[PDB]
């Protein structure tokens, strides 16, 4: 996260670290959506252009964390993956369209002060809150500059008008993406960066005072560049896929 701040303790209890077993490194963010399901970006698991194609056994998820590198004894829980599901129409060949994936945990994680699921939006919540100007929140342990944080970082960023998103890049933008970030004339700054991808863009509904995951940190061109914006997977648009997977392969 560029130009963010240290998270408060328990501020993002759905935040998950995707962690490579060997060598031991942070791959991506992710989020806890139930006791056995974790949401992340498909490109965190599968990206053929870079010979990335992880299996379940290559990976761990670390839940309840604050410190990036410390093993947080008695706080964090580490879970093994039962099964990975990648969206069938995830477009790694072109523009990361449908950059979403689910991970089913071998066993349910226990909720606690530090571990708790975020909500997925319903159609009305999306309609109501996914508006230009409305701010969401992005969290992660990625780089501080286009170095690395001691603890989980947080930044609030406004959703951006679709024509402006489109006009900022040569990449083809789809209805399964939205962009967020400050304009050069707005003065304030902030973005995700390397290692933040797969984590959540969340909003707090003013109607029922619950946090909803509206986006997944998907891609950008640089970090916190003037006239550029971070692009996020539109979670509500893919929710039928999410629900299908969980209905069929969940217990």
């Amino acid at each position: 996260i560029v130009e963010g701040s240290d998270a408060e303790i328990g501020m993002s209890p759905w935040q998950v670290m995707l962690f490579r077993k060997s060598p031991q490194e942070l791959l991506c963010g992710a989020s806890l959506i139930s006791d056995r399901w974790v949401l992340t970006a498909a490109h965190c698991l599968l990206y053929p252009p870079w010979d990335k194609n992880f299996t379940e056994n290559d990976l761990l998820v670390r839940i309840g964390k604050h410190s990036r590198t410390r093993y947080e004894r008695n706080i964090e829980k580490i879970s093994m993956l039962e099964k990975i599901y990648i969206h069938p129409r995830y477009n790694w060949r072109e523009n990361l369209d449908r950059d979403i994936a689910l991970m089913k945990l071998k066993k349910p994680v226990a909720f606690s002060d530090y571990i708790h699921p975020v909500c997925l939006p319903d159609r009305e919540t999306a309609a109501s809150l996914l508006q230009a100007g409305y701010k969401g929140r992005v969290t992660g342990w990625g780089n501080l500059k286009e170095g690395q944080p001691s603890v989980l970082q947080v930044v609030n960023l406004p959703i951006v008008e679709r024509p402006v998103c489109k006009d900022s890049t040569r990449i083809r933008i789809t209805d399964n993406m939205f962009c967020a970030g400050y304009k050069p004339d707005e003065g304030k700054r902030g973005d995700a960066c390397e290692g933040d991808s797969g984590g959540p863009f969340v909003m707090k509904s003013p109607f029922n005072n619950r946090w909803y995951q509206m986006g997944i940190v998907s891609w950008g061109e640089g970090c916190d560049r003037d006239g550029k914006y971070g692009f996020y997977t539109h979670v509500f648009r893919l929710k039928k896929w999410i629900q299908k997977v969980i209905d069929q392969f969940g217990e």
Binding site: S22, Q24, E25, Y71, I78
Partner: peptide, 10 residues
């Protein structure tokens, strides 16, 4: 770079 995690997890 990262602190050693318990080996039960690996």
């Amino acid at each position: 770079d990262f602190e050693e995690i318990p080996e039960e997890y690996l």
